[PDB]
Amino acid sequence: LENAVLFEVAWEVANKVGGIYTVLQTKAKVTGDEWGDNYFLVGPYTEQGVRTQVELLEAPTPALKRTLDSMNSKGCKVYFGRWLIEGGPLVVLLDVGASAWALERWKGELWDTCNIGVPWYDREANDAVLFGFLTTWFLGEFLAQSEEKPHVVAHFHEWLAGVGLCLCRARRLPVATIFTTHATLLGRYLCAGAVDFYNNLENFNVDKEAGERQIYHRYCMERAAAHCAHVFTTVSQITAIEAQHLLKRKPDIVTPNGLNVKKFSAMHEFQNLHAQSKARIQEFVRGHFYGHLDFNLDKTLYFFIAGRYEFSNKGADVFLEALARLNYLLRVNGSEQTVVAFFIMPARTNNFNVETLKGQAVRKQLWDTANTVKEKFGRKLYESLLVGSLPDMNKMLDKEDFTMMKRAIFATQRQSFPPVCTHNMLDDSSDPILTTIRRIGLFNSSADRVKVIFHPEFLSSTSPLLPVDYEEFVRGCHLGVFPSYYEPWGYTPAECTVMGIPSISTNLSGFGCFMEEHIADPSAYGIYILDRRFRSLDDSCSQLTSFLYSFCQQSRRQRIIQRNRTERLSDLLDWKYLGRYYMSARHMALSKAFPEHFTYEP
Amino acid sequence: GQAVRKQLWDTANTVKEKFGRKLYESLLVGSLPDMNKMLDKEDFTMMKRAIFATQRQSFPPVCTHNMLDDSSDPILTTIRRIGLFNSSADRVKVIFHPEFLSSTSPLLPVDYEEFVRGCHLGVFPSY
Amino acid sequence: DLENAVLFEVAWEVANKVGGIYTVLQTKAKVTGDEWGDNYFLVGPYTEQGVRTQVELLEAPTPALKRTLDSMNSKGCKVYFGRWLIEGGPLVVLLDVGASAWALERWKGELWDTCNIGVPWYDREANDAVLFGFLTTWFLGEFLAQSEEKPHVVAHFHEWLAGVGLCLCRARRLPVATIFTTHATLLGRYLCAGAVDFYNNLENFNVDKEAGERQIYHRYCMERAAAHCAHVFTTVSQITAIEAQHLLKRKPDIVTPNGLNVKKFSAMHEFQNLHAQSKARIQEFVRGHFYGHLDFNLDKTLYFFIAGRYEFSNKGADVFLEALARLNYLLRVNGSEQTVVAFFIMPARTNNFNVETLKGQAVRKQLWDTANTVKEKFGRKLYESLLVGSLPDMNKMLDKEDFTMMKRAIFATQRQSFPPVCTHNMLDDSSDPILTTIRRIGLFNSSADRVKVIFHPEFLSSTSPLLPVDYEEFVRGCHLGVFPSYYEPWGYTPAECTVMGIPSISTNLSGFGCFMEEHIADPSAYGIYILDRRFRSLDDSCSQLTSFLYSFCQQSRRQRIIQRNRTERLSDLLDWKYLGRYYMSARHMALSKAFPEHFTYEP
């Protein structure tokens, strides 16, 4: 309300390291009008990041120029710029060149103030604290040199900026404080290390488990920041439950991350981009299985699962045993429906697999041998239509063309079952996905109604096998199944829902909890939500199959309606809707720190 | 006639691709083409109508362009006199092009140096 | 109702393919093929040309039907019972109109002691209609006689050509319920142009005088009498119902609007996919017809569509031409980038195509030739550059040869003269009502003009040198289909438009426009603009049309798509599924009125 200058503090600002970068990428537009030009982004300085993202500019206000000049003084570095990303974000890039002065003197101060020590072994630990003092310096100077300074909000993202949170309030600078944890630090190691992490979220000895992993300095850094914040904020309501029972600070507001959504001129252009991308997947599955194309591709479905290669976290284990049962239900029942599940999770690869790479080259061979004799037919028809005669149709193709086509069919034929992995792996037997595939019994056989393709790399437009982008490949697949146990927010299930493609999310996922909260209808709107908190592994697998078989039994027309319904939920995941929550958080903090000038509006 | 030639090239490209797509899903399936079902009733009606539009009763023209003085033109006057109206019975068809060949031409898009090389014989009686 | 009853659909257009009634009867077959099942039959004229295409002969299922067919065939009359090959498998009783040996004079003398209507020998179909009339009454008569305890029969009569055989059934007093469905008022057609303000003077028109002045009295008398000798009188349109109330002198009991069997695509947006595909093929035409004069953004261009028989006053081309002349002003005096390319697809007498509409297509092709040459040459130089490992230089991709090729293409694709209005050459160019108006209003397809009028004097065909696309596809390509009319009993040209996703400007005088006013409350909101032409002058109607056209012109890309999706929803209204519920009321209304005890009143 009252004019004020706020700062968004994160490590991922002009770094491009984590997913927090992608959050603040498109957050800049919606926050660029709510506080206007007054808002800033405090971030670390990298010379690599400047050449790409940062364009340096002078200070508009004379107080800011004094603050930047003073920041240059005392062996500290500032590089005020403007981020080249859309929104016009004015960025305050602080270098680690101030390592000589801030780290040694203020580590003792941090000890006399926060009582948190930093091990020298951990690299980003010493780098985070430096960045922490540098932020407090800039905020401190901004409050001091600006006469009658408006209420300040310091918006802190991730553990790396969590240290500078307690310092901004340690110096008692008149500043309202927000901490937005996009992922709980201790929650990541607790997810796999401790069984039933969600079930035992209350039980977990909060100090013991952090110390067993030698991450205590980091948990202590993430906490304290929580306690030394008026408004504590989580992206997910499931992460809010995490913070309530582990970080021990209940999130004041839940501000879910948002995606800028591409608005097309036609509201059905996503469905036009569906058929175009489906055909490019059709060129792949026609090629990968050659001589084994005894399945109707007109009535075939594509299931999609992506993310970092985490077998338990990105819930590949749930989805693999579910397709094994979907193998049964589509085979014991007289069904023509074939499902081609794609596993796009990048891992260590030597090179491309021989038979897959051959299959694509024989695919074009059976396109070349179907273009040569096609042109023969084309000329014979053009010279028959010009004469004035309908093609005989039994003399259009010569004996040579039948020998060409007869040899094309002889080359294509294979006996070996089509491969499961698109690439060749260094550790094939040790690979958790490939080990499960051979266990469940899906070798991409003729009898199998589900054929598993594991592309052990990110997709690229410049690829020998599958030359399509990630964004395009999602739009091609019919359904995007994302079972999860530990996703703070689903950046992959949600990018799916931003597009017209329906996504099977889960209750433990941040996206799935958001869809349960906002909209009342789960399956009706398209987004299937899997109960994984109050259910066993086996029930969760079976619920996936009832969800998968529901989509399998769906008709052509009903699939299109559901894909149109999922398009309507893009507005819900737009920064336009999901940035309202952050705006409330900023307003809520000002009220907590300084009540008289700013109305709380609670 | 030039537009019809491209029309009978377009109607011979549409059903060619329809032949090609049905063949490619026949070669991939593992079966040589049937060769009789390859073209549907939709394709046959396209080709049957294309032929019906092609049909002309007028004999193809002696001069490619339209002249200001057609009757006064010494070449065209001789053609109608000798009796070569580009008929089916005629074994010689005379095709006068009243203007220089060009590559930027709606009809006959070939330049003079290329057009000479295309023709089998270059007859030049002179006085 | 629909229990223990038989319906005979009697029309001249049954297995003939002459008029629009053929399409109505053909399409109605499927919805009527389950309401009365296999029991319904269609009585029609017999043509050996029509049999080879449409009729497959079959034996009689019921033994009584064999008796009826044999007795009529034996008693100096000709019948060819069979099944129509159109969808719904209608069973057709093709009666030979060629068998005129004795009925022509003896039966006409019987017609005069009964109906007191005489037939002139000069009029061909007049003598053929009455023959077909007696033959129907014979078949119905035998069917009632030889079938012991016969279910009540509903004789469903379409057009004046069957209208004579209507009164015979009542004259014999055979137990038969009777329906007459006039798809177009006979006397209304000549009154439309001959008498000024036909709709305004519909009550005033001297009903017997005007019929005699044009020597159609035998047929007006034939169409009337059929009306009076029918329990249920039925009109296709509510505007035709007003016509019949003051011309045929019968208020139509029900209005059963004609319907189209809509093509439903697996995707509910496939019409809009077929929009862009067909728009591009129109874009290829607009790039050709206008060459060297292409200074108009084609992304922001609209296509207006008008079709039908070549009737300048009836199909309301006069209204639409003076309206584009004002739309020329409103899009030019206001700083607008919007260009509108109106297409007039009304077939007329043509000699051949036009030099500059076929040369423009040829230069469009040369500029696709001299682009494809310098693109493959670009492509080959690019392919050998990416393999070496270098991004294309972009100043050295194209050589000096390519610049000379492209520079000469640009020189050839230059014209001083403005693009042609018509896309063919006419026999009577000056006498042509459309072309005369175009030169009068001042739209010569100029650079300054924001509306360019193209009149394709012939029907669209896939096999065409200039514009190779079907009629069905061309409608789907155009943004808006404007159909002003004065006398369209039921507009199928605007009707088929609304079946597709394309919005259509109908009128109050049209049968389709009156239907859209009656059923749905929202006119312009649902897409179908309705023009007031009954209570307004010519000039006001042109201006109402201008405000309707300018409303579509000021519409954005996105708002156009929404309206086209809304017009798709109105296809269900024009489906025989929604429009055949009206014929069912007419049949139900008849069984009851003719035979009250057996069939419920159904009011």
Ligand SMILES: O=P(O)(O)OC[C@H]1O[C@H](O)[C@H](O)[C@@H](O)[C@@H]1O
């Ligand atoms: O994805 P499916 O349910 O197989 O449906 C396939 C359909 O996808 C899109 O909607 C396209 O626009 C249609 O042309 C296609 O028929």
Ligand SMILES: O=P(O)(O)OC[C@H]1O[C@H](O)[C@H](O)[C@@H](O)[C@@H]1O
């Ligand atoms: O017809 P317009 O309003 O110019 O819109 C043009 C649009 O038509 C359809 O909806 C197509 O699917 C779109 O690809 C295209 O953008």
